[PDB]
Design a protein around this ligand. Structure first.
Ligand SMILES: O=C1OCCN1[C@H]1CCN(c2ncnc3[nH]c4cc(F)ccc4c23)C1
Length: 167
């Protein structure tokens, strides 16, 4: 039993809710919140910008030190950093950004990072300003992630479309 509330169950291990991931993280304080990161961990907009703003820029400060030490992530890769006031840990995962021409096949590699964590609160990778089709992202999620994932979808209209079209 866990504290996630109001989720629709899609499969054995995948759950979904129309929610602001920032507000959901603040309320649940999950072990892991996933950030929709880029390779430079520059959290300017979308989910990343919102998560970073909620940490009062502490996420960005920590991220800048990470990059200065380790260099950029790979598209499809991830790193574990602090969850600050939102979660124990933040798993920064880089999905391909279609608006930069990155290969959508890398979306499966991106979701594989979730399997290293038993339970996660996450957005749909490569959705929103990353330019992929969220219906496709949900399908890859369900077909790749085997651990327990609680997906937060900000847009109510999109949430209803994702549920209604789910096979
Ligand atoms: O949700 C969504 O509908 C439309 C597309 N799309 C994607 C992109 C945004 N993303 C999110 N997912 C879950 N929580 C979120 N909180 C946010 C706060 C912000 F300021 C900007 C983006 C998000 C967000 C999924």
């Amino acid at each position: 039993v866990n504290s996630f509330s109001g989720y629709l169950k899609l499969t054995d291990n995948v759950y979904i809710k129309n929610a602001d991931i920032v507000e959901e993280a603040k309320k649940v304080k999950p072990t892991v919140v996933v950030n929709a990161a880029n390779v430079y961990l520059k959290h300017g907009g979308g989910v990343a910008g919102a998560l970073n703003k909620a940490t009062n820029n502490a996420m960005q400060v920590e991220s800048d030190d990470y990059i200065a030490t380790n260099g950029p992530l790979k598209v499809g890769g991830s790193c574990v950093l602090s969850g600050h006031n939102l979660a124990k840990h933040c798993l920064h995962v880089v999905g391909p950004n279609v608006n930069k021409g990155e290969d959508i096949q890398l979306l499966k590699s991106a979701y594989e990072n979730f399997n290293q964590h038993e339970v996660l609160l996450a957005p749909l990778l490569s959705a929103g300003i990353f330019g992929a089709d969220p219906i496709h992202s949900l399908r890859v999620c369900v077909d790749t992630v085997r651990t327990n994932v609680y997906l937060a979808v900000f847009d109510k209209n999109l949430y209803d479309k994702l549920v209604s079209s789910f096979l």
